[PDB]
Amino acid sequence: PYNLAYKYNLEYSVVFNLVLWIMIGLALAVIITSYNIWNMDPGYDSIIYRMT
Amino acid sequence: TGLELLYLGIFVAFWACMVVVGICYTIFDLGFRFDVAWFLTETSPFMWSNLGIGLAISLSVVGAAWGIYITGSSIIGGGVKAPRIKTKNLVSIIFCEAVAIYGIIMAIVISNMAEPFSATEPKAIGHRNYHAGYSMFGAGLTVGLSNLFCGVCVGIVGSGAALADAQNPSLFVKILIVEIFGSAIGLFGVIVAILQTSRVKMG
Amino acid sequence: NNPEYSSFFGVMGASSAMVFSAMGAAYGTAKSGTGIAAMSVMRPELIMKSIIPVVMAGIIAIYGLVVAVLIANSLTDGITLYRSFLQLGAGLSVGLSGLAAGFAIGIVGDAGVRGTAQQPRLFVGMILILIFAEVLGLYGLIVALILSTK
Amino acid sequence: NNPEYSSFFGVMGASSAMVFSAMGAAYGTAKSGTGIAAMSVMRPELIMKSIIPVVMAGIIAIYGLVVAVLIANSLTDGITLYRSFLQLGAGLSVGLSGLAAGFAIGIVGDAGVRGTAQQPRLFVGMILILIFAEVLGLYGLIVALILSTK
Amino acid sequence: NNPEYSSFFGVMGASSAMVFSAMGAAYGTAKSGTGIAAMSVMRPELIMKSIIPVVMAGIIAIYGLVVAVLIANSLTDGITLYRSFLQLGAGLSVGLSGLAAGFAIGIVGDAGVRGTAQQPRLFVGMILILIFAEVLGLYGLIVALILSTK
Amino acid sequence: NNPEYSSFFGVMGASSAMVFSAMGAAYGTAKSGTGIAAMSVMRPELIMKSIIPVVMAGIIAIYGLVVAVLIANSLTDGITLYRSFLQLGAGLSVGLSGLAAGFAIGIVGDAGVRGTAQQPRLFVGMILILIFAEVLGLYGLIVALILSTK
Amino acid sequence: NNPEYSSFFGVMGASSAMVFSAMGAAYGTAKSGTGIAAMSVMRPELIMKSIIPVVMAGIIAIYGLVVAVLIANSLTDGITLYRSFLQLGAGLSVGLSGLAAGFAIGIVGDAGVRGTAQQPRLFVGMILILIFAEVLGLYGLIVALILSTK
Amino acid sequence: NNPEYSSFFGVMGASSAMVFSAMGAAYGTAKSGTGIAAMSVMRPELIMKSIIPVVMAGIIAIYGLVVAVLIANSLTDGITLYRSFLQLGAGLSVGLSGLAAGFAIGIVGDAGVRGTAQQPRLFVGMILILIFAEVLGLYGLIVALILSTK
Amino acid sequence: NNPEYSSFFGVMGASSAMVFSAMGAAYGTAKSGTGIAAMSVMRPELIMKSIIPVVMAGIIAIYGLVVAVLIANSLTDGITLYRSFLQLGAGLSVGLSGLAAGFAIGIVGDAGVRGTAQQPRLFVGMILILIFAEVLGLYGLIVALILSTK
Amino acid sequence: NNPEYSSFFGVMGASSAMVFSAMGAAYGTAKSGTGIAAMSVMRPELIMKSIIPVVMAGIIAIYGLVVAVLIANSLTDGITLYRSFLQLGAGLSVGLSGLAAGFAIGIVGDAGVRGTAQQPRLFVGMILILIFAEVLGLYGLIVALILSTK
Amino acid sequence: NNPEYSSFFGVMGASSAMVFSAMGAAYGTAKSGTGIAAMSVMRPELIMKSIIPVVMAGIIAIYGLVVAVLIANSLTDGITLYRSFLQLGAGLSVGLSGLAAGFAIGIVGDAGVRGTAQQPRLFVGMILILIFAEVLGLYGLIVALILSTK
Amino acid sequence: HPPVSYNDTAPRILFWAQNFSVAYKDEWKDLTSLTFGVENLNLTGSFWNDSFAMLSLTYEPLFGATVTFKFILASRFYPVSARYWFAMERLEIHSNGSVAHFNVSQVTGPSIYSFHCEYVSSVSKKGNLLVTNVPSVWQMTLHNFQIQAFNVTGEQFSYASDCAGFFSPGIWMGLLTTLFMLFIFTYGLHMILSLKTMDRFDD
Ligand SMILES: *[C@@H]1O[C@H](CO)[C@@H](O[C@@H]2O[C@H](CO)[C@@H](O[C@@H]3O[C@H](CO)[C@@H](O)[C@H](O)[C@H]3NC(C)=O)[C@H](O)[C@H]2NC(C)=O)[C@H](O)[C@H]1NC(C)=O
Ligand SMILES: *[C@@H]1O[C@H](CO)[C@@H](O[C@@H]2O[C@H](CO)[C@@H](O)[C@H](O)[C@H]2NC(C)=O)[C@H](O)[C@H]1NC(C)=O
């Protein structure tokens, strides 16, 4: 109507930092654990080593 | 590469995001909210001052520990078949701990001029306070890093000297010169730190 | 008056005094144990002889505990930022000096046990170097006291 | 009078003191079990001489449990910021200390299990090292019970 | 009254709890299966009873699921921060503890199954070892109950 | 009243809910395939009994597809933060649990298929392990279901 | 009325609807050329039988083309913001599903072409699972339809 | 009436295609070169018949040139942000599609060049797979054309 | 009316073009130089021929220079966003195209130099390949020749 | 009428004009050393005949020196953003071009110096290569001049 | 009057100026000492004749100190921003140049010590190379000086 | 819901608030109903001038008598940026031969752009607009405050600068401290996590 503001809420910094750091923590945790799981050793010991 | 991939990923992502936000701010004509003044002023100087105080011995002790262990492993490894070198090579660890001594005396010097105030707006805190905080933080960083690298250098040269000395017992007198030339930079950092923090008058 | 953020920093300092220092001690002990294994089979009589590194690791832990108790008694609701940052600095410095000393003692203890496993005369020598490790921790603790006054 | 986000730090402690402590146990009982796997063959009758590190891991898990429960029991809606910071600091410190202790106990257990397998008289001495790692656990607990009230 | 962004913490807590339990259980089953297959190449008569470890891994997953339902049942459109937040903490704690316990159970099961292939006596002892892993996940459970009521 | 930018979380919830299941299915299929290639290089007449792992891996895909269909069906324009937050949480949970299931199925299927190449008796036992893997995935769906109605 | 910025997201979806899809198919070929390179030399009589993986990896390009033209034609300057997020979701989600399918088809085709040189009876078996490697990709596509028109 | 940064996004696309497509082309040619070094060293009669992969790699570069010249001519001062977004999207899509096509073309070219150096009959087969890769590149181009005139 | 930072983007383009061209030419010259250095130990009589590759690298550098000076024939005080942005795009495109060229010429020369070493007959065909890489760089210049002038 | 922080960029230009360039020179010399000693072990008389790459690295450094001196002389307290940005661009361009030239010169010098110890007739050809890597740095200087006078 | 944050840039300039030069000198001396210690066993009677690179490495520390002394002397609590930016630029330039000189001197002395051990006649040649490293650092000094007196 | 606007020819001062309340002896009474549309406001003492704007709102008899509010604001050249920066500095209440004062803390920004805030009052749980003690008896609140004074081009509001910001000083302090601790922790974690055990025993 008269080109008013967005009515942004105070405490914006708190909620933003909260969301950002919790999300980063969860994403880094899942990435590193999944990386560990994907890289794992079967054995190349008896079942897998032998051929013919 | 076993796990440093994570570190490289974090580094690259952080700097790419920094470039992106910087250009996004610039072309949007929104540079008036990138107020470096606000960040540098509304942060109380006490945080910078105590960060400097901690670092000034943090880094010195880290360098000293690095030097002692890197020389210790070699001296004791060589002494197993050459017991005669066991006591002769104390000088390397003496020089390694000298950097810690220098670090702690610097901490004592910097720790003075810590008078609390009651100002709350930057105009009340004032130029003298801001200069004092910044200068002593910088001096702490300088002495810390200089002592760290001096410690690493003297540890390496002492390791080499100790390894070589087990072979021909007439070599130790011609390898301490590099050790002293190493300790020179450890002293240089101290004196530059003093030169920086000379004129602090916080209050 | 003072902000409400002020109580944060000081408390965090205490945590450091019981994380970082402790962690260093832990490493030390672990490494020493490995040494004992390599020495247990061949020179069995000197098992108790090598009680000296492990205790010399635990002492680092002790130091941390001291400072922690102190920073648990100087904490009050009405703390100015000055006190908070003093305490944070003390905690950080003591924790990191403990950590560095712990790494040094661990490596030196491995080397010491392995060296004595083949040369009795090396014994005293190893002890000497070990002292230079432990003392480093004390240096950190020093500034903690200097930061409970100024 | 006090912001709602004051709850944040507090209950994060009530999580962390548990979480990290469990991680430590997951290293104490696991790698020790891997060692007992090798021990079982050459002398299967020394399982009672090798059940120590797992009980140590359980003990540190109990430590994490009791600090986490006690801190959680002091929860309220109008908690002050000061109390919130106190609880977070205590929880984090005990959690990371437990993690470090678990690491040390696991490594030394894996070494000493097979060390005793090859060399019987190591056994008693092995216990000694474990006790010192356990001491670190105690120390973590102490700080939390110094931060619960004061 | 309450803000417009309350449920986020509760839902992410439930998600984190269940997902971490799933990851731990998947790892545990994978390691147990690897050990089972490696052992069974030589002696089929034992396979029917070597399956015990993977069973325990499943139990850890079960813990996660049950806890999840609680965080899902006390959610409404207008939650205050306090309640949903306690739910976040409970979820994080249970998930991470379950993940650690599953890791330990899996590695233990693989190592013990490998060991029992040639010494039939260890099996009884192996059971007890795995118990001292499972209870660690169960400790997480207890914490959840507390943060599911206050 | 309702923010205009609330549909984003729901869209992301659906996308995650199917994408992570797809990743899990792809991993499981690839691992089982590389296993059975070497399996069938030698033993030809069992080329059809060993199809259970790939079918079990496809269940992760069907879970992702059904949760995608349901999560998209209940979507609408005027979404309050309540339902969108629930939707995101549920999608994230199901997707990541499906990923865990995919990992477990792939590894176990490879090891067991390579093992059963030599000893037929193990074959039936293999399915039992795989069953538990499926059960884990089922839990990952179930929680999401409740969060799609609460 | 709605901010022009929302149109951003719409276009972004279109980009995805090509790029990732292409990448999937590309990796397929990027392995296939290897296999047939080391397969004709020992066995030149069936050169025209290792091109099925090529088409199985190339249909992903068709899927990407279809969804890309759909998103491109749906774009206009009067799109509501909710619809632009909707399109972004469809594009990203089909792109990642296609990438996963590309990974799977590439690895499984490598295994099949490698195994065919030693055992003809293996051929049909691989083709069976190849269908599954395609099916997961298609699953993503159907979601896009339910995500675009609605 | 329009922002001043509107052109920025456009010119980013004006670089993007002409970089990325070009990059892929270079890569392909590079690998082709080393393939020739491994082929004519023994059998040199296929020098002139093995030049096809190089031009097949340069085709993506000529495609990038065409898109770049179009986007250059389609840029004026009275532009609106919508078409600027469209141009950026088209540029990125062509660039990355060409990069993928170049990678695939190069890999298959190297592998099949070695394979045909050794064995003549593979030759015809090589060309088929290579064409598939090139088709993928062309497909990307089509998308951009739509986005340049929507 | 015009802003106070318009010239920054233009200047950065003018710099980046020369930088990336220089890096590409450096890589190409270095790789070709080490190639011919390794080559020359066997056949000195071909030396003056084998210098042809590096010559091509120099030509690419020349291209960069030209475009740079072009940008320095238009810089002035009151440049609108338009011209500076166009300079940025043109410079970046030419620079990265030069880098791609340099990479390709480097690898191709590296392989082909030894290739012609073992058999001189390859030589002429080799330079044929190299010319293709060169025209790649030329294309980049052409694009800038439309934008910097616009 | 002008901000003072406009001076910032200008001084930064000076630093680059002597920093990155300097780095390049250093690297070149180092590489030359690892050739030169490696060559003198058998043919000492050639030492004075293999210093040329080092003098060329010296010229590379001198370029950066002269441009930095000019840039510093141009500086003044009351500079408009125009001249400051020009200084920054010139410094960056010359510095990084010098870096690339030094890198190429270093690798080339090492390879050629090692090579010439066996085939003397290499000599003249080597120098040709060197000049083709020196002119690179020269081109940097040219563009910097055009930015300083303007 | 100047703004409040004037001295930060000058302080950090001096700090970096000393720190980076100390880094370079430490690296150079460490490497040179490594070479000397390695060489002493074979030909101890030349030790005095080979310490020259360490003496040259010290000059980097001297340059760092002199710039630090001047720059700290010029500092005052109320400088203008122009001056502080000159300070920062000079500090960065001298620090980076010193680091590069240290790298060069270290590697060259490392090669040269063994080279001289192989053949005495190398010596004078080595000296020349050393000069062409030392002067590089020297150049940096003078540039910084013009920046500090401006 | 129209805003109040001064009419020195083309309008110059614009102020709006979604809600507005004042209380004398801790007795809340809504005032938005009586303003922002009531053309009978005694907007007389208000005065405009290049680089000065005194906004005055005098209220007819209620709360005991007629009561006046006065919100001052002014802009000024800043050499450090070559711009014009504005702030509203003082709130003055005028009453029965008596006056009350209040600083202003954060309401500032470029003079080209309007300013917005969500809560501005002298009551806890929001936090703003307080002077050195003298508690007095005056409660004064606006919700959804917005203003522009110095470079309005008509009956409209320009771009709105908001007091929220992506960060606050305490957040930056905590973030830096946590970052330092985290770096140190991950260094220690790397060193401990690289530990490996032996493979076989002696003898
Ligand atoms: C907020 O409003 C205040 C009242 O109008 C402004 O003025 C400040 O009032 C303070 C209280 O009177 C003054 O402090 C005292 O001034 C007397 C003068 O005679 C001195 O002796 C005292 O030592 C001094 N006490 C102190 C500083 O503790 C302030 O000096 C006075 N300030 C000014 C600039 O006039 C406030 O300034 C205004 N803003 C702020 C940021 O407080
Ligand atoms: C401005 O704020 C006041 C105070 O909160 C609002 O008035 C309240 O309205 C509610 C809802 O009807 C009543 O329960 C309170 O008793 C009222 N208080 C007073 C002091 O009047 C008022 O409605 C707000 N104005 C608008 C337009 O929403």
Ligand SMILES: *[C@@H]1O[C@H](CO)[C@@H](O[C@@H]2O[C@H](CO)[C@@H](O)[C@H](O)[C@H]2NC(C)=O)[C@H](O)[C@H]1NC(C)=O
């Ligand atoms: C608007 O407010 C002003 C300021 O209070 C009023 O001016 C006062 O008028 C009364 C009545 O004539 C005088 O006794 C006072 O001396 C005036 N005060 C000042 C400071 O000049 C003005 O009358 C009010 N206007 C209306 C229409 O009520």
Ligand SMILES: *[C@@H]1O[C@H](CO)[C@@H](O[C@@H]2O[C@H](CO)[C@@H](O)[C@H](O)[C@H]2NC(C)=O)[C@H](O)[C@H]1NC(C)=O
């Ligand atoms: C301040 O002036 C006002 C306006 O006259 C007075 O306010 C009221 O005055 C009436 C009549 O005497 C009293 O009944 C009320 O109690 C007063 N208060 C209110 C809130 O209405 C007030 O008395 C004057 N204050 C003084 C002279 O100290």
Ligand SMILES: *[C@@H]1O[C@H](CO)[C@@H](O)[C@H](O)[C@H]1NC(C)=O
């Ligand atoms: C101010 O004046 C303008 C121009 O005459 C008019 O349109 C507007 O309605 C007036 N506003 C008020 C609040 O009196």
Ligand SMILES: *[C@@H]1O[C@H](CO)[C@@H](O)[C@H](O)[C@H]1NC(C)=O
């Ligand atoms: C009005 O503006 C003029 C011009 O800047 C200034 O001199 C004068 O002081 C201002 N009026 C008041 C009351 O300050």
Ligand SMILES: *[C@@H]1O[C@H](CO)[C@@H](O)[C@H](O)[C@H]1NC(C)=O
């Ligand atoms: C305000 O607008 C006027 C009219 O265009 C202009 O002269 C002035 O520079 C603008 N800015 C300020 C800060 O007054």
